Amino acid sequence: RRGSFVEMVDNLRGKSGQGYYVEMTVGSPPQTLNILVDTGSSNFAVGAAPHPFLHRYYQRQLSSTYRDLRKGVYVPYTQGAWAGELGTDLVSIPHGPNVTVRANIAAITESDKFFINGSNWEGILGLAYAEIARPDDSLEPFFDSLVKQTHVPNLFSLQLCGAGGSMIIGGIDHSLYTGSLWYTPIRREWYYEVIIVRVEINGQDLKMDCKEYNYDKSIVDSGTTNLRLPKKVFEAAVKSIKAASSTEKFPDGFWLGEQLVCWQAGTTPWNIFPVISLYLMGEVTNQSFRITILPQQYLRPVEQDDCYKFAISQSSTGTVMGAVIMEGFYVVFDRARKRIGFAVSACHVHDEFRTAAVEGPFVTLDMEDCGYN
Numbered sequence: 001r002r003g004s005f006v007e008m009v010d011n012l013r014g015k016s017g018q019g020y021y022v023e024m025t026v027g028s029p030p031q032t033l034n035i036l037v038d039t040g041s042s043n044f045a046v047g048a049a050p051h052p053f054l055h056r057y058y059q060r061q062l063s064s065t066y067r068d069l070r071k072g073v074y075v076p077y078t079q080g081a082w083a084g085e086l087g088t089d090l091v092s093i094p095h096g097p098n099v100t101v102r103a104n105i106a107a108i109t110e111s112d113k114f115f116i117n118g119s120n121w122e123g124i125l126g127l128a129y130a131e132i133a134r135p136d137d138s139l140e141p142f143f144d145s146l147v148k149q150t151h152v153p154n155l156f157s158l159q160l161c162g163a164g165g166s167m168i169i170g171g172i173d174h175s176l177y178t179g180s181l182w183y184t185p186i187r188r189e190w191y192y193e194v195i196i197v198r199v200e201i202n203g204q205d206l207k208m209d210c211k212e213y214n215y216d217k218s219i220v221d222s223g224t225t226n227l228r229l230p231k232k233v234f235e236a237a238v239k240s241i242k243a244a245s246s247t248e249k250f251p252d253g254f255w256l257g258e259q260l261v262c263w264q265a266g267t268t269p270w271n272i273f274p275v276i277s278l279y280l281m282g283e284v285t286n287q288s289f290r291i292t293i294l295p296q297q298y299l300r301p302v303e304q305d306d307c308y309k310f311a312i313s314q315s316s317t318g319t320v321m322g323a324v325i326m327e328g329f330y331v332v333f334d335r336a337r338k339r340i341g342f343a344v345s346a347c348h349v350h351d352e353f354r355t356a357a358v359e360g361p362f363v364t365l366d367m368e369d370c371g372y373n
C-alpha cells in the first residue's frame, strides 16, 4: 500500500460548499495559510491584514525573504474583488511537490465580498495562464514559476470531492479515477478554454447550434461553484430539465437559484432529476466524447432537513464548467500537451442506480466552427 504521488492525495479541504483549498507555506520563518485552488484566474494572493472573516494572514514584516515589488494590484472577479501590493517570497506546498520557489505574491490589504465567513481559506491560487493575470501578463503566475524554477512536470490534476479532494502536482494518481481518461484540447492559453459541441438532458439533445454553447467562451473553473451557461443555453436547459422532472413541480425561483427546496433527512428523490451531458471536442478530427453529471452534482446542499439549491445558472461571459462539473470527475490539466483530461472520479457523489460518466468516442462534425472568434 503506497503510491508515487501518495503524499499529495487528500491534500485539499473545504468547509461546507465554499471552495477547495490547499495549504501553502510562504516566507521565512514559515507562514502557512489555506489557499483556494482556482483554475479560473491567474494571481496568487493572500490576505495580508486583519479581516473579520480571516483567522490568520500573511505578515510580511516577519518574513526576512520578502521582497517588495513596489506596485499595487487590483483584481475583480465575477464575485468580489480585492486590492493589494505585489512582492515575491519563498513558497512551498507541504502536501504538494517537494520543492520551494520564489513566486509573485499579492498581499491583500483591502477587499469587497471576496473572503467568505467560515470558508477557512485566507488566499487564492490562480492556476490559469499569464494572459489574464493582473496588472498584466508580465506578472508570472505561480505554476509558471514552479515549472521554470524546478523539475516539476508542467501538469497538475484535480479531484474535487463534493458532499476534500486531491491536487496532484507534476503528475496523475491512478487511484483517483476509474475507467479511462478522455482529453479535450485547450483551445487557447488564457483561461482553460475548451469547446463544447453538444449538450443532452437525459440523453435528449438540447438541439442548439454548438456556437451558442461557447458563445464568447467555455472554460474549466474550479473557483466557480456553478455550471454557468450562456443566456439562451440556460433558458433551453432549464426548460428541458423541467420537462424531464415533470413528476414533481418546483417554483420558478428554484430554477433561478433564488429559492431552496428541502427534503426529509435522507429522502431526496434524485431519481426524478435528469442527468446532464456535455460533449467535448476530442483529440482526433471529428471525434468527441461526453461527460455526464447527476443531480448530486448540480443540486448543492445548504447548511432533519436536507435543503438544496439548483446550481446551474446564467452567464453573459460564456460557459463556466465550475465545481458542479468538476466534482463528478478527476480533471487533468495537462498544460504540457495543451489538453484537459476527464475521468470518472473515484470520490464523486452518486447512488445505486446512476453514476457520473465519461464515454467515447462519438462522431461530431464541424467542431471547429463551434468556437467564438
Ligand SMILES: CN(c1cc(C(=O)N[C@@H](Cc2ccccc2)[C@H](O)CNC2CC2)cc(C(=O)c2ccccc2)c1)S(C)(=O)=O
Residues within 6 Å of the ligand: 017, 018, 019, 020, 036, 038, 040, 041, 077, 078, 079, 080, 113, 114, 115, 116, 119, 124, 191, 219, 221, 222, 223, 224, 225, 226, 227, 228, 313, 320, 322
Ligand atoms: C457567479 N458564481 C460564482 C463565481 C465565483 C468567482 O468569481 N470565482 C472566481 C474566484 C473567486 C473565489 C472565491 C471568492 C471570489 C472569487 C474565479 O476566478 C472566476 N473565474 C473567472 C472566469 C470566471 C465564485 C463563487 C463562489 O460562491 C465560491 C465561493 C468560495 C469558493 C469558490 C467559489 C460563485 S456562481 C454563483 O454562478 O457559482
